Design a protein around this ligand. Structure first.
Ligand SMILES: [C]C1=N[C]=C(C(=O)O=P([O])([O])O[C][C]2O[C](N3[C]=NC4=C3N=[C]N=C4[N])[C]([O])[C]2[O])S1
Length: 518
């Protein structure tokens, strides 16, 4: 793979690549579609619109939008103008967005109408620098100053040339959370999604022009950003986007060609999603779908889920591990080489290290801390030098995982080194859940650990000490957590206990809870 030139604008690169297929569908969702030509026009018109309102090169804008054909226009349009889009989760609270607006110093916000209310709350309570709010598909009247995304794009002539960016300049940000502290702004360069899209999308998955890509993982996830934007645009594939929550019925409807007259040939999701679909009553048969490749990421794929998917569809699930910091997978099974119970082999282009307790090599079969050296690594966490020093160490990126290398060169996941839990393939901090539970007036203490469910998938499990003298029923506690935590963070069960095992210094002995002692 030939490195990108030093003068390089990722958005312009993706546009140029597809000037050979102007009338092929680039993106299609429930209500709209965009050829590569139409996408290029609207991308460059949005870039001009953003510059016209005074957003200058290297400044950030907040991109808070459901998956839809407007999403890649917003993302590539900012990048084409040398403006840095900060692409964020659509299921967060006003407080979360308030912090992101201040931390990013976003100068404009591109928001889906359905998300305007939470953004309104975030703008009102924050010390933001937002100059303009641009609402894609408004769901309510427009407040003074705000503009409709389609009118905004339609009102400016396409920018004549891209910003003269370098390949190592920041191009976009994603946020990722550790076990405590604020979400971390992961800064990715113009080069990084070129490397992931060439090394993984093209050379590992073998995506191609006649593919139709469909990702249960949303575009604001690093995984989804590759699956359904950078990978397909790199090979000219057509991408199906879906705004709504990715339930089995929603997914099946798309698999069967219920949207845009296209049937997906490549599907991406988390193992939890695959388990959910395999259990659905209306699982399609192979003759009904056009899938040729099924990708999985976010959490380890239990062998039995892959085996059941293979037995039903005649297709393996290809399990790879990536991270927000590395942007896409660096360890992966191959489409024609799958070993269930492992994450496969290093992606060519990435060097992998397992380090022991002195930082040195570990022997095959023993766990070590995983570190990755690859050309797609994020450069830093914006504004957090301490965590950046901890993570990005002179060419090597600490993943937070432990892995075991097998005799055939494959790698088996062996857990985290930080307490973080991956539930439905999404980061969850047990300390957040604990902190939420102890604000219930009936809870004295709480400890949360991860437990494998019947399918081998990790879920939170809560141990709660009731506050003496307070009626506390499981049902009232479930309702308490319903409106305070996103559903994927719900504890699978809650065990009420009279005490928690504690050292003798006030620390909960969480491993005894993992061990089943209570
Ligand atoms: C491609 C891709 N990108 C991204 C991803 C992810 O997931 O990211 P985040 O959120 O940052 O996270 C990371 C983590 O998670 C986990 N995983 C993933 N994948 C996997 C896993 N594990 C196991 N296996 C697999 N496949 C870990 O922890 C990491 O570090 S993807």
């Amino acid at each position: 793979v030939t490195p990108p030139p030093e003068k390089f604008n990722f958005a312009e690169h993706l546009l140029q690549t597809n000037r050979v297929r102007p009338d092929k569908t680039a993106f299609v969702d429930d209500i709209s579609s965009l050829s590569f030509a139409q996408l290029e026009a609207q991308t460059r018109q949005l870039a001009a619109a953003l510059r016209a309102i005074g957003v200058k090169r290297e400044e950030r804008v907040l991109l808070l939008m459901l998956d839809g054909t407007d999403w890649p226009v917003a993302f590539l349009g900012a990048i084409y103008a040398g403006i840095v889009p900060v692409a964020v989760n659509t299921l967060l609270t006003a407080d979360d967005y308030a912090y992101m607006l201040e931390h990013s110093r976003a100068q404009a916000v591109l928001v889906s109408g359905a998300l305007h209310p939470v953004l309104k709350a975030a703008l009102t309570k924050s010390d933001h620098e937002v100059q303009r709010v641009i609402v894609s598909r408004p769901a309510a009247p427009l407040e003074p100053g705000e503009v409709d995304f389609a009118e905004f794009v339609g009102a400016h002539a396409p920018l004549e040339k891209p910003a003269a960016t370098q390949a190592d300049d920041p191009a976009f940000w994603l946020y990722s959370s550790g076990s405590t502290g604020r979400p971390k702004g992961v800064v990715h360069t113009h080069a990084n999604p070129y490397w992931t899209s060439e090394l993984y999308g093209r050379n590992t998955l073998h995506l191609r022009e006649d593919d139709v890509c469909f990702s249960a993982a949303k575009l604001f996830f690093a995984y989804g950003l590759g699956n359904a934007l950078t990978f397909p645009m790199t090979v000219g594939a057509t991408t199906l986007l879906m705004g709504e929550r990715p339930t089995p019925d929603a997914v099946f409807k798309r698999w069967l060609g219920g949207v845009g007259g296209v049937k997906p040939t490549v599907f991406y999701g988390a193992p939890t999603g695959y388990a959910g679909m395999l259990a659905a009553p209306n699982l399609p048969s192979r003759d009904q779908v056009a899938l040729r490749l099924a990708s999985s990421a976010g959490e380890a794929l239990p062998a039995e889920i892959g085996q059941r998917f293979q037995r039903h569809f005649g297709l393996d699930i290809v399990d790879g591990i990536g991270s927000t910091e590395m942007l896409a997978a660096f360890l992966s099974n191959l489409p024609d080489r799958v070993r269930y119970g492992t994450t496969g082999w290093p992606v060519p282009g990435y060097q992998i290290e397992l380090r022991g307790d002195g930082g040195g090599p570990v022997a095959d079969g023993e766990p070590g801390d995983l570190y990755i050296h690859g050309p797609s690594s994020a450069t830093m966490y914006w504004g957090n030098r301490a965590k950046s020093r901890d993570t990005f160490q002179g060419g090597w990126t600490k993943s937070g995982d432990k892995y075991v290398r097998n005799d055939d060169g494959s790698y088996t996941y062996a857990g985290r080194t930080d307490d973080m839990l991956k539930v439905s393939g999404i980061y969850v901090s047990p300390f957040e859940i604990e902190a939420t539970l102890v604000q219930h007036p009936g809870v004295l203490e709480a400890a949360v650990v991860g437990v494998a469910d019947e399918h081998g998938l990790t879920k939170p499990k809560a141990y709660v000490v009731p506050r003496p003298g307070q009626t506390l029923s499981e049902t009232e506690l479930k309702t308490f957590i319903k409106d305070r935590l996103a559903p994927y963070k719900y504890p699978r069960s809650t065990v009420f206990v009279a005490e928690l095992p504690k050292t003798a210094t006030g620390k909960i002995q969480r491993f005894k809870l993992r061990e089943g002692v209570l």
